UniProtKB/Swiss-Prot annotation, chain B:
Induction (free text): By TGFB1.
Subcellular location, record wording: Sarcoplasmic reticulum membrane
Domain writeup: The calcium release channel activity resides in the C-terminal region while the remaining part of the protein resides in the cytoplasm.
Span covered, complete protein: 2895 to 3337 of 4967
Phosphoserine PTM positions: 53
Stated name of the protein: Ryanodine receptor 2
Post-translational modification, as annotated: Channel activity is modulated by phosphorylation. Phosphorylation is increased in failing heart, leading to calcium leaks and increased cytoplasmic Ca(2+) levels.
Amino acid sequence: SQIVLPPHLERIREKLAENIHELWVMNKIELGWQYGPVRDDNKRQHPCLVEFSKLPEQERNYNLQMSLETLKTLLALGCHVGISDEHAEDKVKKMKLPKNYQLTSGYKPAPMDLSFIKLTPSQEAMVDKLAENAHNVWARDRIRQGWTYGIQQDVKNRRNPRLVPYTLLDDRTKKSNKDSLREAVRTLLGYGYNLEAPDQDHAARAEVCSGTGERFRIFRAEKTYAVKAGRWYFEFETVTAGDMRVGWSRPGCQPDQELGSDERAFAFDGFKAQRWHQGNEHYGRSWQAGDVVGCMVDMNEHTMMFTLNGEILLDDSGSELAFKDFDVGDGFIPVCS
Amino acid sequence: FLQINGYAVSRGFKDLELDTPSIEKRFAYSFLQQLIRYVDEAHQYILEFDGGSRGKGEHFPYEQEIKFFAKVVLPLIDQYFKNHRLYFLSAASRPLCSGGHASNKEKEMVTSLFCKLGVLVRHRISLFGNDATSIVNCLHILGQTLDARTVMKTGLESVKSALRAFLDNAAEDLEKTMENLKQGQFTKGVTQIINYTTVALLPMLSSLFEHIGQHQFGEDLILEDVQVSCYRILTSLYALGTSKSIYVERQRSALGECLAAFAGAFPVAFLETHLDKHNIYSIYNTKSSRERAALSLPTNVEDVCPNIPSLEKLMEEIVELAESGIRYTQMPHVMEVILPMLCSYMSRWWEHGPENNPERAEMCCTALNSEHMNTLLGNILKIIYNNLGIDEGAWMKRLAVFSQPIINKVKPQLLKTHFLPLMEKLKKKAATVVSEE
Ligand SMILES: Nc1ncnc2c1ncn2[C@@H]1O[C@H](COP(=O)(O)OP(=O)(O)OP(=O)(O)O)[C@@H](O)[C@H]1O
């Protein structure tokens, strides 16, 4: 309702009203339902195929504010309705219609040659948004008539499987909305009112959807298993590539603190290819799904090293060691974040 | 006390409107417009210098303008684009995914700046007051920063014409260089033309073709009549590489590196003409006979270029020279030029070679074989360790760099059973001051 209706949008809304009536009659005649006073599937009759005046005025108005909300949603999302060619507006041509496509009444269902215009990936994006919005409209109506999701179909319990988000929606309904919007938007493009959707914005959503305060979980061996001296090897297998840190930690590591932020632990981050100890700097290479990381530490030489798929990871510098020098302290234990 | 009494303080003025989406107000937009407008002003300044150089008033009335341009504008372009390569290079393919994708209009303006700088540098080295190195560095860096796909898909027809005309002018100038070298072995205007070529024209083309091949934007950068411009460039470069003169010899290296870059970048297998029928990227296939006749084309894929021979013929020549054991002093030109272009073509067309795509058979652009690359590598290594005792050159390292990608594509094990005998045969002549990997 925030979007206002300009006079040009009104005059093209008239043409889109003839568009929608022509779409009604063309869809009905193509699908096979005949023309009838009452919309009965068993009788194969449709006032939609009949003229809109004989069509019930409640359906006429419902589809009129249907078109109105569609146009205002296009404007709100970011398209700017604009007239391209006065000659294109003036010229109106009917598509060649076979006898079967010909409707029972005399209102020939032809806005223009829709096949003339070409298609844009932005047009696909905004048509998909229109279909998602229309499915939301139907679902919201069904909610306020009390319909709920159900695996089977029962009018008595008002349960319908199609009351699901458009992502999980069935291909039949998706294709119905898709071809309806194909026809509508192609007709509007034939009119010349191209819909200039806004450009995509560069952003990192960060996929931060974890419930409550915890953002990461730290797994470590028992403190009693700390290694004071010697040469030790253990493997960390990453099933999915992402935010992981693997390395060696002191027994005083705090579970709430992120690995490698402080002096508690030494860690390797494959997501950003950065080794972590009291800060980060670029080291090694990013792993992939299924990779294995081998953590190697020499307490005698105070040298600690990492591998990815059996290859020694390297700094930006030529030094092979992940961490050159560190006091032995009270020993290290394996850890992952 | 305001807080305690409850009176809530807000800003003095609520924002009336945010003009954030518009790109014209952005700093990069304004800086690029500023740079372009100053470059164009310097362009008509140099036009006035063309009109007055023969005239009495040689001294610039716009002396401050020219000196400011040379001292500030060019180094500023250099440093800015060197520091911010990634911002322009990002083309929604997510380089530096944190942020900084350049506007399409800004990419168009970058390309227009490149065209304007090329037009300015064209045949004006003597006009530039020793700032020729700075200008060619600007062309180099800007060509590195150029983004081809975004401009080709969405860009102004004037920008298309500017880039196309820059490449056409470069092709015509280098063709004229080849023809005047051929007709006159001597060295005036021809001397200044060859100086322009060797100093600026070969570097800009080499850098642009290297970048365009590396980013694989040549596919849409060179399609129609710019493809035949590239044909002229390739013919002229190969004819100069095979050409038989002391000046062309002292410019072995520039022409050789340019030819290698062109082999890497060019999207039609000129070495394998007979097998290009299935390739859609061939300009003959795209044009059809009517467009071929409309342009200046022999209509024969094999006879488009007489000087370049068959790829199999080149390979037989390489293997027979390797068997005969020729010297670098005796016969330098092929060894400097042909092997780099052959390796670059090798590497570029291994992707279309049937090894990567055994499916979709006989639509492979070139029938490239592992034994084919391994035989080429054997010939190259044979020749280099034979010329090792012949006082060699820096083309040792040059050819090592040129053939490293071929080694990368070659299997480890398939390379072995020849590598170790070859490696040791290099070892008992590796006892020289320069080492080869
Ligand atoms: N002739 C038609 N026959 C069936 N559905 C039609 C027809 N014309 C339009 N539609 C629309 O197709 C969709 C398919 O109907 P669907 O069974 O999914 O829901 P519904 O009948 O509106 O509600 P309910 O959840 O009670 O079944 C509906 O949005 C309906 O309005």
